[PDB]
Amino acid sequence: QQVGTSQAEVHPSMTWQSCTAGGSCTTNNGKVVIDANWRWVHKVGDYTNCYTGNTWDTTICPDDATCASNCALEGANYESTYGVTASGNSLRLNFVTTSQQKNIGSRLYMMKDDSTYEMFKLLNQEFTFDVDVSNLPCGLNGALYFVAMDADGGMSKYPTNKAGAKYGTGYCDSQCPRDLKFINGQANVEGWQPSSNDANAGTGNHGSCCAEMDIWEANSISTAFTPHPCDTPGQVMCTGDACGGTYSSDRYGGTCDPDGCDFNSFRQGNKTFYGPGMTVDTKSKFTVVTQFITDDGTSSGTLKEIKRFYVQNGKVIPNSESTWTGVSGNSITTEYCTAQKSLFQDQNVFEKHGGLEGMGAALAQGMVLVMSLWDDHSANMLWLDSNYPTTASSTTPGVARGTCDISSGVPADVEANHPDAYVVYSNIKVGPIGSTFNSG
Ligand SMILES: *[C@@H]1O[C@H](CO)[C@@H](O)[C@H](O)[C@H]1NC(C)=O
Numbered sequence: 001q002q003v004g005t006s007q008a009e010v011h012p013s014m015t016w017q018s019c020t021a022g023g024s025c026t027t028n029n030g031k032v033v034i035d036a037n038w039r040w041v042h043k044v045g046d047y048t049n050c051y052t053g054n055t056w057d058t059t060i061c062p063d064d065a066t067c068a069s070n071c072a073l074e075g076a077n078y079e080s081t082y083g084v085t086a087s088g089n090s091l092r093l094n095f096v097t098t099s100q101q102k103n104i105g106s107r108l109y110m111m112k113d114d115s116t117y118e119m120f121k122l123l124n125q126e127f128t129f130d131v132d133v134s135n136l137p138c139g140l141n142g143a144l145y146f147v148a149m150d151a152d153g154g155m156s157k158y159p160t161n162k163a164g165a166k167y168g169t170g171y172c173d174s175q176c177p178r179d180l181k182f183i184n185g186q187a188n189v190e191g192w193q194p195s196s197n198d199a200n201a202g203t204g205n206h207g208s209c210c211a212e213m214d215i216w217e218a219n220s221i222s223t224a225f226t227p228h229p230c231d232t233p234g235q236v237m238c239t240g241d242a243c244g245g246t247y248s249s250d251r252y253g254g255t256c257d258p259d260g261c262d263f264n265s266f267r268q269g270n271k272t273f274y275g276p277g278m279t280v281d282t283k284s285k286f287t288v289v290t291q292f293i294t295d296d297g298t299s300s301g302t303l304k305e306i307k308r309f310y311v312q313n314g315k316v317i318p319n320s321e322s323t324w325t326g327v328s329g330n331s332i333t334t335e336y337c338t339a340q341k342s343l344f345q346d347q348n349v350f351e352k353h354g355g356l357e358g359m360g361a362a363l364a365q366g367m368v369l370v371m372s373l374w375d376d377h378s379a380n381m382l383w384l385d386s387n388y389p390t391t392a393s394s395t396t397p398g399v400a401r402g403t404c405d406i407s408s409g410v411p412a413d414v415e416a417n418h419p420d421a422y423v424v425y426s427n428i429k430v431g432p433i434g435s436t437f438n439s440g
Pocket residue numbers: 269270271272273279318319320321323
């Protein structure tokens with residue numbers, strides 16, 4: 001896609017810190033950028049939309065290549081259009097924002113400069129941040145995660161992408177999403193079908209696959225952390241139902257793990273660890289620490305464990321024990337993942353696509369930091385905070401993931417009832433293991 005000039009693009013500033021062993025930290029002058037799919041996209045030299053609602057203008061966009069030549073991405077009004085504000089080290093995302101139109105959610109990337117994403121290298125490090133999830137109900141997800149995107153959003157690779165990381169291009173994840181309008185400097189107009197329950201979304205013939213480390217998928221009820229390996233760690237375009245993932249008919253038939261190896265304390269058998277009034281109390285802000293432990297204690301070792309700590313009211317809180325017979329420990333390891341998928345009777349494509357070693361291979365490439373807020377038009381967020389699948393018995397291991405009602409989270413309802421919902425991410429720190437909090 002091309003660059004529109006009607007609205008200048010100015011990235012809100014957000015600082016984060018780099019820490020050294022011993023706990024000293026240096027402040028980095030980061031900036032954030034909204035993902036290209038949220039943007040106005042119009043004919044070059046005109047105001048005519050290339051895409052409106054959930055359908056393309058097939059005169060401007062008769063095929064994927066012509067569409068990319070003829071269609072320009074615009075700059076964003078972060079606060080007024082998108083409900084996005086930042087100050088100091090804090091980023092706030094609001095759910096619904098009404099201007100001339102009604103915007104729902106957002107997805108932001110951390111930038112190193114105005115044309116380059118910050119490439120985090122997490123092996124043998126910890127990532128730590130503070131969050132306020134107190135205004136997130138059932139059905140919403142404030143996600144903070146990492147994906148193996150290209151640092152320039154694909155500009156050097158794809159000359160027909162003139163916009164790049166400045167306009168939030170190049171997204172990919174472990175669902176191999178087919179709902180993206182531009183992938184690899186081509187539109188996705190070919191094969192495009194509108195969503196049956198999302199007035200703003202649809203899916204095309206192309207998807208964008210890469211490995212994904214879900215540090216944080218959460219609301220006030222439940223949270224989960226989840227590595228998703230792929231056969232290739234970096235961005236790849238896929239075609240058709242062969243993509244696999246949530247957007248295709250056979251979830252498990254592609255090159256990425258769409259389920260991941262998850263640790264949700266509630267799902268792992270402790271109903272009183274995370275939530276309102278719980279050990280980790282969602283009514284207030286708390287710190288989330290995530291460690292990526294390697295086999296040899298260096299950044300070139302193989303990923304072997306993912307550990308989680310929380311800090312709240314100055315108390316360091318280790319992750320809760322998994323309580324199911326045969327599925328113990330409080331971290332993600334290969335042995336956990338094998339044992340968990342077996343007990344829960346889930347298909348283990350985690351191992352098939354490389355397990356933790358494959359996730360570590362993605363981490364070694366460098367990864368982009370994503371902060372988002374969304375509702376779930378495929379599964380109503382029930383997989384995070386309710387029984388899933390909703391037909392199953394809540395006494396079966398793996399079924400119950402939080403206390404939300406099985407009828408919660410319908411997007412029409414979520415959009416109507418919680419337009420005011422918001423999340424606040426702040427105080428990001430990255431450094432050697434133990435360096436970012438009162439360890440260990
Ligand atoms: C839940 O986790 C907390 C903190 O680790 C612990 O004190 C409590 O006993 C746990 N509950 C169960 C059922 O294991």
